[PDB]
Amino acid sequence: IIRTPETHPLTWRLRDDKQPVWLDEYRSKNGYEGARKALTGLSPDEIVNQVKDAGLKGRGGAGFSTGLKWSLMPKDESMNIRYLLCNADEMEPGTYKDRLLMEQLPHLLVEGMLISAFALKAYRGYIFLRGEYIEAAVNLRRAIAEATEAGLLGKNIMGTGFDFELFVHTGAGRYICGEETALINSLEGRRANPRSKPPFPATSGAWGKPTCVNNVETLCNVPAILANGVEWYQNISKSKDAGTKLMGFSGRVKNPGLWELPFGTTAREILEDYAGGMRDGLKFKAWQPGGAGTDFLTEAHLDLPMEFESIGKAGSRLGTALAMAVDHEINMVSLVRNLEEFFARESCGWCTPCRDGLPWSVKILRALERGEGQPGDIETLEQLCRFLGPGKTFCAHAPGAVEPLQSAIKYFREEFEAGIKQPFSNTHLINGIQPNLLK
Amino acid sequence: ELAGIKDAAPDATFRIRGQKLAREPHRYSGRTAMRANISVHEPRQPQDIDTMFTFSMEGNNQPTAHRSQVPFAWAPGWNSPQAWNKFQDEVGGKLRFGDPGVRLFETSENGLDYFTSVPARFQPQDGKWRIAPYYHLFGSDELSQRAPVFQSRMPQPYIKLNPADAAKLGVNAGTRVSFSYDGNTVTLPVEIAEGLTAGQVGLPMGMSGIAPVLAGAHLEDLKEA
Amino acid sequence: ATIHVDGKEYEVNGADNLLEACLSLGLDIPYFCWHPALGSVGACRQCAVKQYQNAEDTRGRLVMSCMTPASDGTFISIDDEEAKQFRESVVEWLMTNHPHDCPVCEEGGNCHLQDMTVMTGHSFRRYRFTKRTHRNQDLGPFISHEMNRCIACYRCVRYYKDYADGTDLGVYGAHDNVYFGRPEDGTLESEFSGNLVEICPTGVFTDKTHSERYNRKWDMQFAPSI
Amino acid sequence: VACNLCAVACPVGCISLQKAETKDGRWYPEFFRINFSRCIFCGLCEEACPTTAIQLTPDFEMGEYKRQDLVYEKEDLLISGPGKYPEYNFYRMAGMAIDGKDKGEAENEAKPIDVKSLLP
Amino acid sequence: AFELSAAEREAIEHEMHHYEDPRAASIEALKIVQKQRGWVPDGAIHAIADVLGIPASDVEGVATFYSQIFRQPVGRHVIRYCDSVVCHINGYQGIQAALEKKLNIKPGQTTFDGRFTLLPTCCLGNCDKGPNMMIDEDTHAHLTPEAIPELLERYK
Ligand SMILES: NC(=O)C1=CN([C@@H]2O[C@H](COP(=O)(O)OP(=O)(O)OC[C@H]3O[C@@H](n4cnc5c(N)ncnc54)[C@H](O)[C@@H]3O)[C@@H](O)[C@H]2O)C=CC1
Ligand SMILES: Cc1cc2nc3c(=O)[nH]c(=O)nc-3n(C[C@H](O)[C@H](O)[C@H](O)COP(=O)(O)O)c2cc1C
Ligand code: SF4
Ligand code: SF4
Ligand code: SF4
Ligand code: SF4
Ligand code: SF4
Ligand code: FES
Ligand code: FES
Known about the structure:
This is part of a larger assembly, with one copy of chain A (439 residues), two copies of chain B, one copy of chain D (120 residues) and one copy of chain E (156 residues). Chain A is built from 17 helices and nine strands. Chain A has 439 residues and is α/β, with parallel strands linked by helices. Chain A folds into three domains: 23-235, 3-Layer(aba) Sandwich (Rossmann fold); 244-327, Roll (Ubiquitin-like (UB roll)); 332-419, de novo design (two linked rop proteins) (Up-down Bundle), CATH 1.20.1440.230. Chain A starts with 22 loop residues before the first helix and ends in a 22-residue tail after the last helix. Chain B is mainly beta and 225 residues long. Chain B has helices at 142-145, 150-153, 163-169; strands at residues 21-22, 53-54, 128-134, 159-161, 176-180, 185-192, 200-204, 218-224. In chain B, the strands form two sheets. Chain B has a six-stranded mixed β-barrel with strand order 3-7-4-6-5-8. In chain B, strands 1-2 form a two-stranded parallel sheet. Chain D is mostly beta strands. Chain D is built from two helices and three strands. Chain D is elongated, with a radius of gyration of 18 Å. The interface between A and E is large, with 51 and 43 residues. One iron/sulfur cluster binds next to helix 14 and helix 16 of chain A. Chain A: Composed of 13 different subunits. Subunits NuoCD, E, F, and G constitute the peripheral sector of the complex. Chain A: Its EC number is 7.1.1.-.
């Protein structure tokens, strides 16, 4: 693998010894050139339109257009208080890309936030970072101090009169805090329940002000767009999803890791040519394309390009594009039990279907694991999958929770049926009362 | 001036399609047993000549009944306080045929003149303590303070003092001091009030032994007991 | 505004949500977390109806009637089979942890949860696992506390903090272990704390003064008084 | 448990009772009276009882000289055993805590988990 | 009783400077108290509420919402082993069992000498190098059941 600035805009500055790149080494490798161009020779609306026609999509997992999200901030001149939030939560099981980005290239995130805050006219920026990323917090605070001492942050940046202050908010360990409205609630110092939309955070977000929440990788894609131009970003690949994406394979493969690849790379190419295939003695059984909240796919889906549209019509989601391989030695019922235990205990507790239906699925899967399942358990799981889908719950935590359960039932129903041994018994006998024997 | 009290409620001849308004729900139980220990013969239904309500279930409490006095909210399938939805014109609005109660007077066409009697500022006189009224939701009302459940919720009797006044009198928080009003030397423990102005003693109005007419009055020989 | 509920035309206020508009029309939609005086938050997910894009639409989607504006030309169905199934499922999910408490519960016969359990048609239990349990708090001489019966509808905290501006009641914990009460044992400090016994749709917050000499609602003799 | 379901289920209205509570919180009838001069022995109260406390028994010999003596108080009703249902115990099912049965000790009940617990 | 120290209070006001609402410093105030004292005791809730100008019920709701804010006393070192899906595939169960055997305590418990407290945690964002654990501030990857006793000796 050879990494060039034109083909690997996010990872070509990565050092061989896995050490973080500081301000002098970053600026030697064309650092803050896109920030200089954006802050000196471009209007904020010009930068917003530049990102919009560059085709940059949300790297958090949903793929919403970043320029469209930036365009939805109000045009009212009296709303002069604006916030840019960097979602550095990254709590999805199977996702480790933002840790690589902020641990080794913190100035890339700082420059992307500077450009985005100038484009959004955001007077303040917050990196909502999870509490478990200690080294990312240290490196980001050091990079912020280095940029402040060199005039890249603070008051009168580049002599343009733009004031921007960047803070690092360290989290206290909940997966729901990565949800953007729940992120805003957590940033305000409240319990991280999500909020109903509309209104979207672009109109009334953090403390009622216009707010834009973006993933680490989206903001890291911003400076290369501003430095090399729109035409370079469109001609990275011939796919409907523009630019490069951090994709990887994890879990009992020969080379588990993370590589910057164009959209449209097939999952088989990542699995064999980059991850080295499965380990010796292990056979491929299934894979999840984009984290714990995505549907399982089989070996027949490995020859599919890693795009939102292609994985979407396969019955799954592209997600974070950090795929997880499941070998033949992994029981699917135990795997989905582990996933549902995570999803049920990470419920924020606001709304009934997730809060009180994910633990039911957990208990059913626990019973199926030890062969204590009863008839109607799989039908209950399927009904839970149907009734926890999009629009039924308050936020998208529970549809993501029930995606792997429904996909594993669809593809590996024989393993779920094998746990049903005992007959159905919900009652005990009461002496003196003859039961109503339903047929 | 009280002519509007006639229309506060309809008279005792008011009926909903010929029947009175029920005081108790249609599933009211124990009719032939609640008084059976006194006598196994069931007494006559209590007669209500005064109002349009009956002392029985034999009456109307329909949510669509043309009335404004609703004894309780119940609809089939709605046994909770949510039955008030069925009793309203729109949910969260008014009762369907108007809220009960009428206003005695309308807003007058002309107003009053300005009151020119501007009082002088408060001056603390030595040896005289102006009584500042302190009211309590649990304790100031007479009948409700007679309720046994209010005694635990009632604050303990006290007298509020400024820190400067308490330091001048040489008392701390909790020390029992005595004062005489209308020849009644009564003793209360002192608590310190930061926001009370000096020259005033804070007294809990309406409590036992402290009448609400003591508000705005003055106190003599208020000293440590 | 003009809405069509189950093929029947109705004239409503467009500034209202669909739940309060349909309840004002006499239609029955089960609900927990909405209150007329507290607004809509869309927590309990009980008030699901099926909204269609137009008249010639048979698929539709499940929406929250309390979170959906009753705008002009709005086509919804309450008696849709999927909507009824989802509402019954929401009641069933609430029933999984609910204690077997109605005979010894002061809310019985006056309980919104009982009414909505009957209204959705849910009477058969297929859940067979354990029920979560909570310890109670002492809330003073007026309000009795029983957190086992909580359905996590958030009505109490919304009323007490957002409406009555009280400070000593809150929600604690997360997922299915959310707890509603004071941070420690003590008397509820708000002068309007007693409205919790009508705001709470279950028997968590109950009238202790009534609980001493308890009787059911059907056994009461009521009068309108001042 | 003085739940008053039998009294409201009675079509004659010949059951009257009042709830009282012990110090540990156990509900019980302070009094319980049945007007047997009114009772039609229909069994709807036993059907409505959720604790199997009230039971119609195979005993018909109930004639009386004075009608006032047909009002049976609690001392004339409460017997020394379980009657027709030998093993049912409502308080083993209820979530309400009483003496000898704390929170989490009823059937199909998990132990209470404090919100301050370290487990996620 | 509880009294906030001068350093804790100064750090709390310094964090209050970073936002337009002092309520936004609640999580970091709880983290400051936890960093100083290992956990957040009961009087710290009222102290942080008094400094921040928000009700104590809100501070307790925040503290009991977030799993990494400890409202019960913990050991001198908090072991947090990942129990998520990739570490399940990579075999976190052997690591957990090795921790059970070495520490003689269940997850969520604290050892008898107060040295260690064992906790499951969600995915640590290190799934390619799993299975993973997090002792107090250090993350350990590529875990094997044989290396667990050697890992536990360097935390006195
Ligand atoms: N660690 C991670 O990165 C995790 C990522 N995810 C991903 O999160 C995604 C779900 O997140 P959501 O925020 O619910 O997705 P979404 O589709 O609702 O929206 C994503 C973004 O687009 C914006 N947006 C969408 N429609 C909009 C509109 N009409 N107007 C204005 N803004 C609009 C939202 O504000 C948000 O910033 C999934 O794809 C899942 O893979 C989930 C869990 C963890
Ligand atoms: C339950 C849940 C958790 C989420 N966690 C994260 C997260 O940890 N990091 C992240 O960037 N996005 C997360 N998201 C997606 C965000 O809601 C949001 O789409 C994203 O952070 C910002 O949008 P962007 O991808 O356009 O940058 C989560 C979504 C949900 C529903
Ligand atoms: S689905 Fe509901 S309970 Fe679950 S995390 Fe989202 S809002 Fe909270
Ligand atoms: S809250 Fe309602 S449903 Fe629950 S035990 Fe009490 S009466 Fe029964
Ligand atoms: S205590 Fe009552 S009002 Fe509060 S959330 Fe629970 S059920 Fe709703
Ligand atoms: S058997 Fe007697 S007491 Fe029981 S419901 Fe029938 S009439 Fe009433
Ligand atoms: S006898 Fe049964 S139905 Fe009657 S009050 Fe007692 S427990 Fe309830
Ligand atoms: S009443 Fe609409 S979701 Fe609760
Ligand atoms: S699954 Fe364990 S570190 Fe991600």
